[PDB]
Design a protein around this ligand. Structure first.
Ligand SMILES: [Mg+2]
Ligand SMILES: [Mg+2]
Ligand SMILES: [Mg+2]
Ligand SMILES: [Mg+2]
Ligand SMILES: [Mg+2]
Ligand SMILES: [Mg+2]
Ligand SMILES: [Mg+2]
Ligand SMILES: [Mg+2]
Ligand SMILES: [Mg+2]
Ligand SMILES: [Mg+2]
Ligand SMILES: [Mg+2]
Ligand SMILES: [Mg+2]
Ligand SMILES: [Mg+2]
Ligand SMILES: [Mg+2]
Ligand SMILES: [Mg+2]
Ligand SMILES: [Mg+2]
Ligand SMILES: [Mg+2]
Ligand SMILES: [Mg+2]
Ligand SMILES: [Mg+2]
Ligand SMILES: [Mg+2]
Ligand SMILES: [Mg+2]
Ligand SMILES: [Mg+2]
Ligand SMILES: [Mg+2]
Ligand SMILES: [Mg+2]
Ligand SMILES: [Mg+2]
Ligand SMILES: [Mg+2]
Ligand SMILES: [Mg+2]
Ligand SMILES: [Mg+2]
Ligand SMILES: [Mg+2]
Ligand SMILES: [Mg+2]
Ligand SMILES: [Mg+2]
Ligand SMILES: [Mg+2]
Ligand SMILES: [Mg+2]
Ligand SMILES: [Mg+2]
Ligand SMILES: [Mg+2]
Ligand SMILES: [Mg+2]
Ligand SMILES: [Mg+2]
Ligand SMILES: [Mg+2]
Ligand SMILES: [Mg+2]
Ligand SMILES: [Mg+2]
Ligand SMILES: [Mg+2]
Ligand SMILES: [Mg+2]
Ligand SMILES: [Mg+2]
Ligand SMILES: [Mg+2]
Ligand SMILES: [Mg+2]
Ligand SMILES: [Mg+2]
Ligand SMILES: [Mg+2]
Ligand SMILES: [Mg+2]
Ligand SMILES: [Mg+2]
Ligand SMILES: [Mg+2]
Ligand SMILES: [Mg+2]
Ligand SMILES: [Mg+2]
Ligand SMILES: [Mg+2]
Ligand SMILES: [Mg+2]
Ligand SMILES: [Mg+2]
Ligand SMILES: [Mg+2]
Ligand SMILES: [Mg+2]
Ligand SMILES: [Mg+2]
Ligand SMILES: [Mg+2]
Ligand SMILES: [Mg+2]
Ligand SMILES: [Mg+2]
Ligand SMILES: [Mg+2]
Ligand SMILES: [Mg+2]
Ligand SMILES: [Mg+2]
Ligand SMILES: [Mg+2]
Ligand SMILES: [Mg+2]
Ligand SMILES: [Mg+2]
Ligand SMILES: [Mg+2]
Ligand SMILES: [Mg+2]
Ligand SMILES: [Mg+2]
Ligand SMILES: [Mg+2]
Ligand SMILES: [Mg+2]
Ligand SMILES: [Mg+2]
Ligand SMILES: [Mg+2]
Ligand SMILES: [Mg+2]
Ligand SMILES: [Mg+2]
Ligand SMILES: [Mg+2]
Ligand SMILES: [Mg+2]
Ligand SMILES: [Mg+2]
Ligand SMILES: [Mg+2]
Ligand SMILES: [Mg+2]
Ligand SMILES: [Mg+2]
Ligand SMILES: [Mg+2]
Ligand SMILES: [Mg+2]
Ligand SMILES: [Mg+2]
Ligand SMILES: [Mg+2]
Ligand SMILES: [Mg+2]
Ligand SMILES: [Mg+2]
Ligand SMILES: [Mg+2]
Ligand SMILES: [Mg+2]
Ligand SMILES: [Mg+2]
Ligand SMILES: [Mg+2]
Ligand SMILES: [Mg+2]
Ligand SMILES: [Mg+2]
Ligand SMILES: [Mg+2]
Ligand SMILES: [Mg+2]
Ligand SMILES: [Mg+2]
Ligand SMILES: [Mg+2]
Ligand SMILES: [Mg+2]
Ligand SMILES: [Mg+2]
Ligand SMILES: [Mg+2]
Ligand SMILES: [Mg+2]
Ligand SMILES: [Mg+2]
Ligand SMILES: [Mg+2]
Ligand SMILES: [Mg+2]
Ligand SMILES: [Mg+2]
Ligand SMILES: [Mg+2]
Ligand SMILES: [Mg+2]
Ligand SMILES: [Mg+2]
Ligand SMILES: [Mg+2]
Ligand SMILES: [Mg+2]
Ligand SMILES: [Mg+2]
Ligand SMILES: [Mg+2]
Ligand SMILES: [Mg+2]
Ligand SMILES: [Mg+2]
Ligand SMILES: [Mg+2]
Ligand SMILES: [Mg+2]
Ligand SMILES: [Mg+2]
Ligand SMILES: [Mg+2]
Ligand SMILES: [Mg+2]
Ligand SMILES: [Mg+2]
Ligand SMILES: [Mg+2]
Ligand SMILES: [Mg+2]
Ligand SMILES: [Mg+2]
Ligand SMILES: [Mg+2]
Ligand SMILES: [Mg+2]
Ligand SMILES: [Mg+2]
Ligand SMILES: [Mg+2]
Ligand SMILES: [Mg+2]
Ligand SMILES: [Mg+2]
Ligand SMILES: [Mg+2]
Ligand SMILES: [Mg+2]
Ligand SMILES: [Mg+2]
Ligand SMILES: [Mg+2]
Ligand SMILES: [Mg+2]
Ligand SMILES: [Mg+2]
Ligand SMILES: [Mg+2]
Ligand SMILES: [Mg+2]
Ligand SMILES: [Mg+2]
Ligand SMILES: [Mg+2]
Ligand SMILES: [Mg+2]
Ligand SMILES: [Mg+2]
Ligand SMILES: [Mg+2]
Ligand SMILES: [Mg+2]
Ligand SMILES: [Mg+2]
Ligand SMILES: [Mg+2]
Ligand SMILES: [Mg+2]
Lengths: 82, 122, 96, 99
RNA sequence: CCCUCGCCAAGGAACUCUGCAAGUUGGCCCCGUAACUUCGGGAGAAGGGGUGCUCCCUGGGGUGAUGAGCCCCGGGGAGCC
RNA sequence: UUGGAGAGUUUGAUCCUGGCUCAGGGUGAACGCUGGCGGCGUGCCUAAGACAUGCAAGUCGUGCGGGCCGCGGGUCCGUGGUCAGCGGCGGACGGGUGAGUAACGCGUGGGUGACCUACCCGGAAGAGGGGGACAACCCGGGGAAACUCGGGCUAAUCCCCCAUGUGGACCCGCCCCUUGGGGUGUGUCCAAAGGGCUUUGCCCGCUUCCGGAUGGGCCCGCGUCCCAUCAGCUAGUUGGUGGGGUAAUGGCCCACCAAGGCGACGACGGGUAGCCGGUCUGAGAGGAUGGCCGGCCACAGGGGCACUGAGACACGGGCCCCACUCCUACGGGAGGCAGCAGUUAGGAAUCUUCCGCAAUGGGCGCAAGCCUGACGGAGCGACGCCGCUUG
RNA sequence: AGCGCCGGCCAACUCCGUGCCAGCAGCCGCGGUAAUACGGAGGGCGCGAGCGUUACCCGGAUUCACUGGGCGUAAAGGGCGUGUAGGCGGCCUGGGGCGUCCCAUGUGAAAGACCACGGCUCAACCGUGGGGGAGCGUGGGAUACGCUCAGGCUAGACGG
RNA sequence: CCGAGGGUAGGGCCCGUGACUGGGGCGAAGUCGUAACAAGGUAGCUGUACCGGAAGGUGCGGCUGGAU
């Protein structure tokens, strides 16, 4: 199904993800439907995570599925806060 | 019953398609070759870029004849064509494959390779 | 030198049988009603034609027929029969 | 939207089909001058009500035949045999262009 | 043994001065047809498909009368040995 | 307005014309001489030649019945494991290659009242009762192997019938619409599967229907190389009617009817080429190019074919033909690296038979988790750029 | 620490050896007993873990010229008419608004590219944010020019 | 029925190759003459035709891009 996950960008030993909504059948770094934030697992910068919480909730609502460690990061941005 | 002038189908993948017997190699004056006999022949038709070409003088063993061949058990066998497999002077096939059935007489005359490569031995 | 691709192939041959079976049966009873309707014979046509439609939608439960193919096939059946019975009439049953 | 085209009917020798010549202009991509190019579309005429020389509009449509992807939309003008003749004179000139 | 004739396993011009002789081919309908050419031809080039009988449907012509009958030239289906 | 340099060379000398030549930048490069380190890239453009060996797609016992071992204990029971089997789901993604293709293949903007979409999400309703088969297993016959054939039993989320009809499907009439869009009336037709826990409650599933979202198919306008020493091409050809076929339009396919369709705005034919985002160059215009990354297309030794399926005419699925190769006990069998490595051949020339699923992602699973040569990394090469040393 | 080069273009000069030989060469050209041009040496110039060479692409090449060329004698006017298609077309007024111009709007994926900031000690590389554009879809607007339809005109052309 | 392909026959295009043959380019240290550039010793050039070892000649017509 359509999914919300981490497309790796950046470079070798310098991981930089764009948390993204794409068809599951896409290649990991392939054309995606929309970008809804970034993530820098190494915290090399003050904001190593951003999430358009507005847009993310929409995709969730309309049937998208987060990966586990995307849902983790999506949690940290409080998309699931009721 | 193959003799000089007789055309034979070649039942291998050497590239020869038709050969014309010019001698039966069986003594000083054998009249006819049958299955298991060797002939010298001219290559009369050949597909492009084969191992043998038109005009070549080759040796071959007769593996099929239209004249029925008689067996000691009182049976006989006969084919629709006269066919040969092109060989070298070790009686070894110059090709890698042989097509169509071949007569079992080949085995006894020492053409083991050819007999085993054949799809059927009758 | 092996796989569950083998399993998948075995399964396809069993599903193969069933799809053909249903499809044949549908084709038979379809043309049958149409033949009756031709010389209609209204009650008999519709009786058989009722049986064809059943086998059709039943085929579309599973993989045999797509719903639209079923819809298409029913449409042509009923369209054919009515137009055929129209040479003479009268429709003795349903439907419709 | 469905594409709408204007042109002349240069053939009606077909059953329920007319041939509509359509012209377009544009500046040459490199040499700038404005140039003319034309194209013939096979148009659906279910009433066979369209006559040679009619200026019509055709609208992009679901396939009717192999090569027919346009219906005739409406009449625009009539009796443009003057245009039809320019098409025909050129085709006529082609016998002179062989060897 | 000779003449005229018929058939022949496998081979298929190996015959002979020479395929001499003898085979092959062979009518009609249809498809199709090269170099070259003086544009006529070459051409029946070559090569190939069809061919009987039965039933059903049908198109024109001649004689009648415009019709039946007779006679002529076709066409399309489905079959049988 | 951030952007534009020229020089050598025809003469005894001159101006002009004109070609040749050079200085610049660029490369998936190669060759010579030389060669210390590191990072990030990057590396068969030739034979889409041929390939030894391993690996590149599996998972689920919370769908089912068993074989073997094992743990607990009373042959039975639980249970754990293992193994295949039956049944799901994935295997149509991901990965490779650029042969073919001058095409609606691609780019771009549009159409579909002519269409499909598994899993996911939201909303509506529902799961009543019967019956049957095939493997496993057993028993035989046949093999060197591939494996195989026959008879006999047995379960299920396997198959079938009946009911129920929320609803949907189809014919005909009516209203709205306006290409086959929505609504309604009679008839006719169609549902289902259970499992697991902590057990009159839950979770995972199953069923019909509307919708959403995602992914697609088809169609259209315009753009897409060279040769006119290729100038005429066309019988499924162009249109119609009717059928067949599809998810759906269409000569897509068929039957008949008509004689049309296309071309100097280059048809037809020949040659070359996968196309684009981009890339290199250039003052710009333009020229050149499309490897690496991204998107789309096409192919899976050559060719045809359909089956299963939501989706394939399917790289590591099936059938057949061909070419080629191999095994054999000589009776017969097997194979498809343009997946990752690796071999050989060809070439001026192009890499390790490495590590790991820790991350990211994908499949299956309630979950643990399993699989993942995608991937993350390590190896080799001054191949490229960048940084550093020999003070 | 190496590689190329030191006649001119083009930055870097002397001695010896050779004597139209051996050889160099991208073009022009060097070599025939005092060679900055061959071979070595000293010296010098230029780059530096590289330096040179071959191949190919764009540039210099306004040398296919749209921007931005030409045809008396340099390469270049068809031997000459006639005329088909096509290209192009006088003065005035109105309709339409096709080209053309303007505004709004959708599309123009990500990467790359350009400006800024930031992360690997810098860089390469990589992350984050920013600004566009042509082109095409749609909506509204303008009418000079070109087009088209209509009506006049006489200066072109034709006729008496 | 269609159908991969196979077979028979006949055409079309392209490539490689061929005894021999035609001319061409380059070489140059040769042989023959000297056609053109001066009025180049016959002004030149030209289309065509016929001819000659060769450059070339001559006819017919044309051009001046001809010296005096
Ligand atoms: Mg054979
Ligand atoms: Mg020969
Ligand atoms: Mg399985
Ligand atoms: Mg039947
Ligand atoms: Mg179905
Ligand atoms: Mg139609
Ligand atoms: Mg007599
Ligand atoms: Mg005989
Ligand atoms: Mg005979
Ligand atoms: Mg013969
Ligand atoms: Mg013969
Ligand atoms: Mg003789
Ligand atoms: Mg003799
Ligand atoms: Mg003779
Ligand atoms: Mg004779
Ligand atoms: Mg005869
Ligand atoms: Mg006869
Ligand atoms: Mg005769
Ligand atoms: Mg001939
Ligand atoms: Mg002759
Ligand atoms: Mg002739
Ligand atoms: Mg004949
Ligand atoms: Mg002849
Ligand atoms: Mg015949
Ligand atoms: Mg017959
Ligand atoms: Mg008779
Ligand atoms: Mg008879
Ligand atoms: Mg009479
Ligand atoms: Mg009569
Ligand atoms: Mg400027
Ligand atoms: Mg310059
Ligand atoms: Mg000079
Ligand atoms: Mg000069
Ligand atoms: Mg000089
Ligand atoms: Mg110059
Ligand atoms: Mg360079
Ligand atoms: Mg090197
Ligand atoms: Mg070395
Ligand atoms: Mg590293
Ligand atoms: Mg490296
Ligand atoms: Mg290779
Ligand atoms: Mg390759
Ligand atoms: Mg090869
Ligand atoms: Mg090989
Ligand atoms: Mg493994
Ligand atoms: Mg387990
Ligand atoms: Mg299992
Ligand atoms: Mg599947
Ligand atoms: Mg795939
Ligand atoms: Mg792929
Ligand atoms: Mg990859
Ligand atoms: Mg690779
Ligand atoms: Mg390609
Ligand atoms: Mg082509
Ligand atoms: Mg398009
Ligand atoms: Mg196009
Ligand atoms: Mg598009
Ligand atoms: Mg499925
Ligand atoms: Mg049971
Ligand atoms: Mg029911
Ligand atoms: Mg389950
Ligand atoms: Mg139709
Ligand atoms: Mg389909
Ligand atoms: Mg067609
Ligand atoms: Mg037909
Ligand atoms: Mg006809
Ligand atoms: Mg056109
Ligand atoms: Mg052209
Ligand atoms: Mg080609
Ligand atoms: Mg290609
Ligand atoms: Mg320039
Ligand atoms: Mg290209
Ligand atoms: Mg490339
Ligand atoms: Mg790519
Ligand atoms: Mg293929
Ligand atoms: Mg294949
Ligand atoms: Mg291969
Ligand atoms: Mg294959
Ligand atoms: Mg199916
Ligand atoms: Mg495919
Ligand atoms: Mg493979
Ligand atoms: Mg597969
Ligand atoms: Mg397959
Ligand atoms: Mg083996
Ligand atoms: Mg083995
Ligand atoms: Mg054995
Ligand atoms: Mg077999
Ligand atoms: Mg293997
Ligand atoms: Mg490989
Ligand atoms: Mg090698
Ligand atoms: Mg080699
Ligand atoms: Mg390798
Ligand atoms: Mg690598
Ligand atoms: Mg993993
Ligand atoms: Mg995971
Ligand atoms: Mg899951
Ligand atoms: Mg659990
Ligand atoms: Mg595995
Ligand atoms: Mg591995
Ligand atoms: Mg890697
Ligand atoms: Mg390095
Ligand atoms: Mg240098
Ligand atoms: Mg000097
Ligand atoms: Mg310099
Ligand atoms: Mg200097
Ligand atoms: Mg010397
Ligand atoms: Mg030198
Ligand atoms: Mg001197
Ligand atoms: Mg000296
Ligand atoms: Mg020098
Ligand atoms: Mg020197
Ligand atoms: Mg460096
Ligand atoms: Mg250049
Ligand atoms: Mg230029
Ligand atoms: Mg110009
Ligand atoms: Mg000039
Ligand atoms: Mg002029
Ligand atoms: Mg001149
Ligand atoms: Mg003139
Ligand atoms: Mg004129
Ligand atoms: Mg005119
Ligand atoms: Mg005009
Ligand atoms: Mg004007
Ligand atoms: Mg006006
Ligand atoms: Mg106006
Ligand atoms: Mg306008
Ligand atoms: Mg825009
Ligand atoms: Mg962009
Ligand atoms: Mg920094
Ligand atoms: Mg810009
Ligand atoms: Mg507009
Ligand atoms: Mg006027
Ligand atoms: Mg006047
Ligand atoms: Mg006058
Ligand atoms: Mg065929
Ligand atoms: Mg064929
Ligand atoms: Mg075959
Ligand atoms: Mg010669
Ligand atoms: Mg003279
Ligand atoms: Mg003289
Ligand atoms: Mg003179
Ligand atoms: Mg003369
Ligand atoms: Mg002479
Ligand atoms: Mg003489
Ligand atoms: Mg004379
Ligand atoms: Mg004269
Ligand atoms: Mg004159």
């Amino acid at each position: 199904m359509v999914k919300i996950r981490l497309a790796r960008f950046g470079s070798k030993h310098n991981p930089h993800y764009r948390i993204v909504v794409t068809d599951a059948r896409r290649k990991r770094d392939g054309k995606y439907i929309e970008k809804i934030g970034y993530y820098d697992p190494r915290k090399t910068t003050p904001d190593w995570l951003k999430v358009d919480v507005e847009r993310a909730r929409y995709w969730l609502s309309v049937g998208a599925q987060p990966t586990d460690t995307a849902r983790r990061l999506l949690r940290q941005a409080g998309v699931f806060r009721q | 019953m193959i003799q000089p002038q007789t055309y034979l189908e070649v039942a291998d993948n050497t590239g020869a398609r038709k050969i014309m017997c010019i001698r039966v190699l069986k003594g000083s004056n054998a009249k006819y070759a049958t299955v298991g006999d060797v002939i010298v022949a001219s290559v009369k038709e050949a597909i492009p870029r084969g191992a043998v070409k038109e005009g070549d003088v080759v040796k071959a063993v007769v593996v099929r004849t239209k004249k029925e061949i008689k067996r000691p058990d009182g049976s006989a066998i006969r084919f629709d064509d006269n066919a040969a497999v092109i060989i070298n002077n070790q009686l070894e096939p110059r090709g890698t494959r042989v097509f169509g059935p071949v007569a079992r007489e080949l085995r006894e005359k020492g053409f083991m390779k050819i007999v085993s490569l054949a799809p059927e031995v009758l | 030198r092996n796989l569950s691709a083998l399993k998948r192939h075995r399964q396809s041959l069993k599903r193969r049988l069933r799809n053909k079976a249903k499809k044949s049966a549908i084709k038979t009873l379809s043309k049958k009603a149409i033949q009756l309707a031709q010389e209609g014979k209204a009650e008999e046509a519709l009786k058989i034609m009722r049986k064809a439609e059943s086998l059709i939608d039943k085929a579309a439960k599973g993989s045999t027929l797509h719903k639209n193919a079923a819809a298409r096939r029913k449409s042509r059946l009923m369209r054919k029969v009515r137009q055929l019975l129209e040479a003479a009439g009268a429709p003795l049953i349903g439907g419709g | 939207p469905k594409k709408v085209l204007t042109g002349v009917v240069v053939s009606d020798k077909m059953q329920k089909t007319v041939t509509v010549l359509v012209e377009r202009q544009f500046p040459h991509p490199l040499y700038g001058k404005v140039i003319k190019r034309s194209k013939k579309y096979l148009a659906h005429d279910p009433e066979e009500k369209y006559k040679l020389g009619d200026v019509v509009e055709i609208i992009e449509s679901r396939p009717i035949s192999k090569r027919k992807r346009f219906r005739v939309l409406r009449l625009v003008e009539s009796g443009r045999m003057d245009l039809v003749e320019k098409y025909l004179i050129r085709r006529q000139n082609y016998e002179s262009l062989s060897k």
